[PDB]
C-alpha cells in the first residue's frame, strides 16, 4: 500500500557519558520488518 506506519517502542542504547562509544551499557533494540 506504500504508507507510513510506526513500530513499537524499542529499548534504547544505554550509554555512560564517560565510557568509550565502543563500550555501551545496554545494546538498544533493533527494528524488525
Amino acid at each position: 500500500r506504500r504508507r507510513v506506519s510506526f513500530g513499537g517502542h524499542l529499548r534504547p542504547e544505554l550509554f555512560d557519558e564517560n565510557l568509550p562509544p565502543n563500550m555501551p551499557l545496554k545494546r538498544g533494540e533493533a527494528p524488525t520488518k
Binding site: 507510513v4 524499542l10 534504547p12 542504547e13 564517560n18 562509544p21 538498544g28 520488518k33
Partner: protein, 293 residues
C-alpha cells in the same frame, strides 16, 4: 586526498575516553569541503530518497555521541543515513563531527546524505561556537572554507514520496515542491522567505495557521497547516529537527509530524535522550533511542 585514512583517523577514538581530539591536517579538511561541496552541487537540492534509511536530528558537535549513534544505527555503510542539519555549534567537537560526516558523504555519496540546518550558516555559527573552534584549532581561513561548503548543502528531502524532511519546518510560501528546486546554490540563508522557513520554523499547538516565532525569525505553524500540507502533496509525515525533545523524538498533530533531536544531554544543560528514526523499505518507522544513564 586519502578518504580512507581520514575516516580511519576520525574513527580511531571509538575506543577512547570522551574528550580526545582528532586533528586532521588543514589541507585535508579543505579537501573534505571542496569535494563534498562538489557532490552537494551535483545532487538535487531537494533529495529524492529511497528507504530503508535512518534519519538523525541535531548533532551540534557532540562527536562521541555521534559515534554512539553510529554504534547503534550501524556504521556507514551498514545503514543509509539522512541527517537533518545542525552539525556544528554548541558542542565541543564540531570539527570532528562535520569532517566525519563530510568524509562519509564523499565515501558513500549515494548512501549518506546531509541536509542544511540553521547552524550551517555563517551568521549563526559565527556566534554559537564553530567560528571560535576553527579559529583556535586552525584558522579563520578554514571557517570561510566551511561556509562555502555549507552554502551548497541541500535543504530538504522526500523519502518514497511520503516523508518530507527538513531541518526547521513548513513555510507559508511553500506551495509547490518546484519552488525548492528552483533555489540556486551556493546561497546564504536570508532573514526571511522560503529557504529561511525550511531551516527555522517550528510547529506550535496553540497557533491556528501561521504565527509569530519568538526566535525572531520565520514562523510557527499549526496542526491544520500540517494536515493541509500532507493532503495537498499526498505525503504521510513531516520529519524535522530544530528543537530539543526530552525523549529524543516527539510527535505533533496526531503523528503527522515528528521532531528528532539526536544529541543526548544537550550542552550539559538539558535532560534529553537522542533519537534516530529508522525507516524500513515498507516505510514502517521506528525510533531508536540513545539514552544516557
Amino acid at each position: 586526498l586519502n578518504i580512507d585514512s581520514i575516516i580511519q583517523r576520525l574513527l580511531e577514538v571509538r575506543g577512547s575516553k570522551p574528550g580526545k581530539n582528532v586533528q586532521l591536517q588543514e589541507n585535508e579538511i579543505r579537501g573534505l569541503c571542496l569535494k563534498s561541496r562538489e557532490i552537494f552541487l551535483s545532487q538535487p537540492i531537494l533529495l529524492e530518497l529511497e528507504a530503508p534509511l535512518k534519519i538523525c536530528g541535531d548533532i551540534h558537535g557532540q562527536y562521541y555521541d555521534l559515534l554512539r549513534l553510529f554504534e547503534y544505527g550501524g556504521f556507514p555503510p551498514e545503514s543509509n543515513y539522512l541527517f537533518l542539519g545542525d552539525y556544528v555549534d554548541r558542542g565541543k567537537q564540531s570539527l570532528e563531527t562535520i569532517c566525519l560526516l563530510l568524509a562519509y558523504k564523499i565515501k558513500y555519496p549515494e548512501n549518506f546524505f546531509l541536509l542544511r540546518g540553521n547552524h550551517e550558516c555563517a551568521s549563526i555559527n559565527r556566534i554559537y561556537g564553530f567560528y571560535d573552534e576553527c579559529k583556535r584549532r586552525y584558522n579563520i581561513k578554514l571557517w570561510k572554507t566551511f561556509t562555502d561548503c555549507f552554502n551548497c548543502l541541500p535543504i530538504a528531502a522526500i523519502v518514497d514520496e511520503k516523508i518530507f524532511c527538513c531541518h526547521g519546518g513548513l513555510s507559508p510560501d511553500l506551495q509547490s515542491m518546484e519552488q525548492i528546486r528552483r533555489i540556486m546554490r551556493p546561497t546564504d540563508v536570508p532573514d526571511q522567505g522560503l529557504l529561511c522557513d525550511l531551516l527555522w520554523s517550528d510547529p506550535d499547538k496553540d497557533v491556528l495557521g501561521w504565527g509569530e516565532n519568538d526566535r525572531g525569525v520565520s514562523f510557527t505553524f499549526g496542526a491544520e497547516v500540517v494536515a493541509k500540507f500532507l493532503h495537498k502533496h499526498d505525503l504521510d509525515l513531516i520529519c524535522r529537527a530544530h528543537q530539543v525533545v526530552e525523549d529524543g523524538y516527539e510527535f505533533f498533530a496526531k503523528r503527522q509530524l515528528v521532531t528528532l533531536f539526536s544529541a543526548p544531554n544537550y550542552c550539559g544543560e538539558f535532560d534529553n535522550a537522542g533519537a534516530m528514526m529508522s525507516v524500513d523499505e515498507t516505510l514502517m518507522c521506528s525510533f531508536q533511542i540513545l539514552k544516557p544513564a
